[PDB]
Amino acid sequence: EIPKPVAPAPDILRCAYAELVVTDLAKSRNFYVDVLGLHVSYEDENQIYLRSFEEFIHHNLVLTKGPVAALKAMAFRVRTPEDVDKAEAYYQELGCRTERRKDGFVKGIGDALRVEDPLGFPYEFFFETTHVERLHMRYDLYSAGELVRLDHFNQVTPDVPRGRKYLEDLGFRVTEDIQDDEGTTYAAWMHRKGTVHDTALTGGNGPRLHHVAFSTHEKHNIIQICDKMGALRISDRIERGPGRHGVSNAFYLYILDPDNHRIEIYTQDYYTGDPDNPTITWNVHDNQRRDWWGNPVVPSWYTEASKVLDLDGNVQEIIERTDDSELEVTIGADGFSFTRAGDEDGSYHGQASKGFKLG
Template identity: 30%
Template sequence: MGVMRMGFCHVKVMDLAEARDHYVNVLGLYPTLETDDKIYLKGWDEWDHHSVVLEQGGVGVVSHGYKVRHESDLEDIEHNASAFGLSTQRISAGEHVELGDMVRVHLPNGHDADFYATATQLGVEVGVHNPDSFPTDLRNIGAPLLDHALFVGDDVETTERFFTEVLGFYASERMIASHEDGAPLMATWLSTGNKSHDVAFLKGPDGKFHHMSFALKDWAKVTDAADILVHRGYDMDLAPTRHGITRGETTYFFDPSGNRNETFCGGYLMYPDRPTITWTMDELGKGLDYYKREVSGTFLSVFS
């Protein structure tokens, strides 16, 4: 199956003007289209029309999208998802702004995943002909791109099976409840390429959103981002640290509506033949915050 990467996250926000200020002036994303109830944004190093959609009217995730390599992949996903036992829906080109025909799959964890092959391409902000290393008009954090997202729902096992058996992802890391044989799966980190993960799923209430993550260049950029957030009066959900899981370097914080964001860098390269790393819940502190080895009070309790 030709899934290349996560393409977008579509989330609801309480106040569109406040959300615009956060995502444009703090994270540094570029608005590409604004309507009465939605804003579409992209990072400076993304070429498709958008990677984030903000919609007025609440909080939490509406859907998340994945770009596939070929139009024919959509038929395969639709057929194989139905054979797997999941319901699907066809969405015609243009119903989601600047995207082609889509197949929506209703996942076992209460989320909707959208798959598409075509998107209007606006190009990266530095161009592709003798480009500079970054744009000169960066705002504050200046996030280059959407990296991954973590979604919450009860049935992690079946969701993981769908992504691995039908879509061709593979598990880079998994967390189980205990050391006992047959212990329930609590979380999974899934890759479709060479990143440590493109998407992750955590056991919890169906249809909930944990975070979307924006890739930064290095640890210095992660700490710079945290400084900017403090300057702007934000409280850290997780101060700059290293994850044991993925080995990535991270900061967690919330947008004005309560949707969790992450700035992230690093992590190991993943390949399909690399052995899956297994964690147990008693070591979640080490997995989340490698240095303090503590689970923050909000990580397993605050979702949107």
């Protein structure tokens, strides 16, 4: 277990941006700008800085050209300048490598701390950022599929309870989780900003980045993204969805960028800001937990995720999960799922729902 430091945790506001390394900057720009409609704050031959419709900080996504596609940083904004100092002390007490840059790692961010966290993930904490034009009423620019906010990250890690405890000490509150009756946690969701989550842990080999998620206003905006991908004849880049989540109650879609980085589009989860917010636990065999309508979860969703980098820019080595696999226990050969607890009718033995099996 990861000890609770004596040093106070930084006051984290929210997820703020991700830096993704991409192999072909022009192909990635086509995806995030021409397909998805994100707004360009800055670009050059090496990077593209993108933001959502309602954002006022400099960016929500930095695309950085490099040799190996990977997550380079997942950044959280803290409440005050002094919280960056607290972050450095906190992670130092945890025994983690840290790097501090007074003028930032990326453009439009000031004083910033990056850390190799105890789960092997590159976290950034910052307060200072260049404000830009907030585009929230620029309906002259608004797309039929407009991405309005950055909502969350989702991380793949082999030991969910170990990670959960560490994030709770850092001040994240768990809103929902998936467990079974034999003591295994498969996934947990945790927040600072008062939505279902700012980050989440998914059980699996890791550290890897499962996805970054953006919000829309309405469900039809997500439908439009699907429709547009069909018109562009890139429906093969729709991985899973659209659907209604069980966990989070959000309407959702997962798509894959040119380096196979997974992006979720998400809308209409619920308020979690009260400190005694009720924590919802789903059983791993409940076939409504991930897709409320019971649609099967494609195997790539469980197996595939992005590499993450260390502070030197090298790929983090992957540690195998030894706990039970959500894929295996639900849709694998000895898997099981139910529609109604205790009812054989609507249950699935050794295959996925709706008439499918693993490819």
